[PDB]
Structure formats: structure tokens, C-alpha cells
Amino acid sequence: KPRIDMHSHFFPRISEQEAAKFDANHAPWLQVSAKGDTGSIMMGKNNFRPVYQALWDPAFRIEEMDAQGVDVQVTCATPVMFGYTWEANKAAQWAERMNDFALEFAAHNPQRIKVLAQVPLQDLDLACKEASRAVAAGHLGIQIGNHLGDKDLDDATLEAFLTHCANEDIPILVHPWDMMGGQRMKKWMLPWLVAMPAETQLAILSLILSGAFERIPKSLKICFGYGGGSFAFLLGRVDNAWRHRDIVREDCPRPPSEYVDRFFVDSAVFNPGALELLVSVMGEDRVMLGSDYPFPLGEQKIGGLVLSSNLGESAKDKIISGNASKFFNINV
Template sequence: MTLRIDMHSHFFPPIGQDEAAALDVQQAPWLRIDADGQRGMIMTGKRTFRPVYRALWDPVARLEELDALGVDVQLMCATPVMFGYQYGAAAAHEWAMRMNDRALELCANARGRLMVLAQVPLQDIELACREATRAFRAGHRGVQIGNHVGPRDLDDEHLVTFLTHCANEGIPVLVHPWDMMTDGRMRKWMLPWLVAMPAETQLSMLSLILSGAFERIPRSLQLCFAHGGGSFAFLLGRVQNAWEQRDIVRENCPNPPASYVDRFYVDSAVFDAVALRLLVDTMGENRVMLGSDYPFPLGEQKIGELVASRAELSVTAKEKILGGNAQRFFGLPDVAGVRTA
């Protein structure tokens, strides 16, 4: 059977309110677990944030579900509300170290089937680089970062420095959208997640391309954008046309935007056969990796089925997208057979 490695899923360790209060009493995230242990609520201080269930914090429950779904290996990363970018650097650094150590504990008895990506205090690049290296050496397979820190996008000098550090250290990077742009017009129907989140991802990718940041970042950087790259694939033609027609667009970008697709990867979380075809046509079968956004309701409920069911994808393409590309991207050891070991 084709190896399935889900490289985009989330976790939230069972952090209590007292532990979260060490970061911030009013807003720090923690997990309120129901008496039956099956359901819970992510809290931010005293406010409810998101209903969740046991697989988010319990590796035993998660592995049971992965068995049922036919997933061999899953890489987990922090639920973005855990980032802590809005806090002081020292406090955020301590928080990141503690969360990263808790993450490794969740994987300790998973027989290599659960792996994690670290979080870092991205508001302080020196501390972020230090924690990225520490966590990577401790067993994390890479880092997950938010797509911006306040008003600073990925082309910001400090964030370029962090990406360069990861390239030099061989640390893979997953960029996840968060803190979505909205001026209050997207109050209902999860519109920040449905409209602004894809736009945030495209903004991050174009900030690296059009600013010339990719000219300063080593090509060795292993960089992936979540959620199929958001709206990037669909709107790349628009960007390409703008680059050709307007000098202001190409002012700092020496090459056509489409020529930069070999600088990054995307996951497969697009939920639609036509969108997946466009994504693979745009990025190439070597640069799309299985990603589910598990265990949230907006994630792929049958992990990998969209890719596996597409007749237009060759057997080789499916093998790459479902597992082979992630193995190469993260430098994973041979994980064939881990589900039955």
C-alpha cells in the first residue's frame, strides 16, 4: 500500500489555566477538558476560543484514528493560537520551550508515527533562531511559523534572517496563516478562515517573491506553505501579467513570479478535485505534500482520499504526494511499515 505521511496536523497539549497564566493571565491559551475526557474547549484566559475533541491532545486517541484512516505517519504542529507572538520576547521564549518539550512528550510512545514541528518566539529573531536549533536537535522535524508578526511580513529583514538561519541549519519550515486580516466586515460564517486565511498565505508567498527576498535566502531552505498555498495557484497568472505590464511590480523581483515555484512546497489541503489538479499543474507533483489540517472540522476528514481518488494523477505522482515528497522534505528515515510494527 502507498505510504501516507500527513505533514500538516495540529495538537494542543493538556495545558491547564494555571500553567497558561505564567504567560498571561488574561489571554494565554489553555485547554479545558470535559469531565468525560472526550471533549474540550480551547480557552484564551476566561474566553472560549474553539471546541475540540480528544485526538487534539491525546496521542492514543490520535493513533487509533490514524489507524482507521490508513495514515502511517503524522507530523503535528502547534495550534496557531499557541504562537504567543504578542507577548514579551523572554516570556514567549520560555513558553515556546515548554510547549516544544510537551510536544515531544506526546510523541514519546508513538513508535515513530507521530512527529512534531517546533514553535519559536518569532518576535525576537535571536531567540527564535536559538529555539529552532535547540528543538531541532532535540527531535523536532522542523519549525512552524505564522505568516506574519504584527505588521511584518516574511520579506521583513528580521524574518529573512530567521529563514536564512533555518536554511543554513537544515531546518524545514512550515508557514501557517494566522491572525487573519479583517476590518470587521468578516464577522460571521467563519469568513476570516474562508476568505482572509487563503489571502494571508498568498500575501506571504508574494512578499518573498516580489520583494526580492528569495534572492537573499539560500536555495537550500526547505519551505512549505499550508492550505495548498491559499489563493496562490489560482491567481499566479494575474501576478505574472502584472509583473510583465507594470514596472512597479517587478521593481525588486528580477525574474517572472512563476519561476519561483521551485523555491517552496505546498500541502494538498484544497478539498476539491479541480483545485487539486490546478495545484499540481502549477507546482508540479514533486512539490505538493499530503496535508490534512487534522483534527479540525475544516480539515480533510478522510485524509489523503482526494489525492488517492484522482484518476488523472499517475501512480508515481500519488506516491510522491501521499508520502514520498514529505519523506524527502523533512529528511525522514524509512517509515514504511510503521503502522503495522
């Protein structure tokens, strides 16, 4: 039964001078070492993130895919690539480049590497153009940040985007980015451990409590990275809020727990017990295998947590294969 990892990232071959053509210092580019096994993602003239070959080089990535026993990998842009804050034409031009770079990457092996597209999400019209064009060009769906500055997914622009994709049977993966906190989580990767889960939970709850799921067609295929943050665990607090205060219930007609059937989440939660609570809340039909490859905080043995757990026979195949197969309509 072919293992599918749906959460993985790539970054293309962009030079410093090319990035500068979009933005002096907000546009990302890749610095590769001369040997070319290691390198670093660069913000203007500034070190952003240390990385290795599997991120840019498809040939290298394929061996590591064999090594982990991963047949098909659905990879997407690095959240830093989004450029949601720039001028729309510059960001729309950017997204066409990146999504093409992505097809170029997967040309190496169409059968085993699948790509998701990015969109200039600050401008609804250019975003809908890109979403459609890129799926036409071969992408299996779209990856978007969880918020545009102070605009959460409850915002009419982000709804109208999701409504678009639902109507065109385009699947969406939502990745947290540009985390809250300001000047509080500077040390020990706290952004990744505190805010990122809260960001994702806020994404989920923005749709639930705003009554977004009532307005959006039930045919939308939407997924949340990293086990939907800390949603599942705090769900009971949400339901309690919903029942005992009216301002929590105004725009939401059903108990918030009833909306678990309207979205998906991936398996990356790094704990046996958290995974078992996840499947208790989400159901075996709504969890997919994501690893966050090939970043240091991604599950280093892909499928490790799932394959070693004590869940259904059917359920295990579902999470590692069955669910991701329908969701992205990959040829099984």
C-alpha cells in the first residue's frame, strides 16, 4: 500500500540578484555551497534558514524518498516564499515563477513528486487566476498561509477564495506562517512550539465560529498542517464557550465540534497519545500523513508515529494512503 506524504516543502534555484528584482530585502533566494550539499535561505543580504540538498535538488530527494520508503510525495512552497505583503502585481508575477519552478522540479519524476501551488492572496482576482492556471498546468491543489496580517480566514476575501476553490474542486492545504507574538518568542524556537499551533487553531476556529462553513460549499477539500495545531485538544473548551456565552454562538449555529467533518488535518503531532486523541476527534477518515520534510523539526522517520501506533488495520492504511489519495485525487 503506497505511502503518501502530503506535507513537504521545496525551494527553487533563485539567485540574489534575481530576488532583488522583486524586493531589495523581503524577497527570498537560495545560497548554495560550492560542493552543493548544504546551503541557506537568504532574506536580501541576511541569513534566514540553514538547509540541505533535498530541498532544491529532486534527484537527491528521490533517494531519501526510497530510504524512508515513501512512494509519492506532495510538496509545496516554503512559507517564506508567499510574499503576501508586497504589491499585488509583483506578487502575482512571483507566484507564476515559483509555481513553474515547482512543475520543473516534479518533471524529474511526475509519478512520485506532486506539487501544490501558491497564490498572491492579498489580491482576490489574481489569486483566483493563479489557482486555476496552476491546477491547469498540473498542480494538484493550493497551499496558503493562515492569515494575511490581521485578516484571518473569517475575512470575506479569504472566504471568497475558498469558495472559488470549492467550486472548482481544488484542494487546499493551510500552513501557518508569520506567527503572532512580536517580541516575546525570540529564543528556543518558541515561534514553532507556541504560536504555530495557536495560529493553526485560530485558522480552524475562524471558519467555525464565523459561520464560514455554512456559506462555503460542503465540497471543499481543505487541510490543516501539524495536526490542526492544538485544536483537537482545546475543542472541549470551545464547545463550553459556545454553550455558555451568546457572543461565542452568534454566528455559529451548531456546536463547534460538529464541524470536524468539514476539513482535514495531517498526522504530524509527534506523540502516540496526541495522535490517538486526534483520531478520536477528527475520525480515521480525516487524517493524512504529513511529515514536514525535509526540515529539521519534521518527523525524521516518515510514517514512524503512524506505523508503530495501535490503531485500526483499515485506519492505518487510510492515514498513510487512503485519505490522501481521494483528497488530492492521486492515481492510487
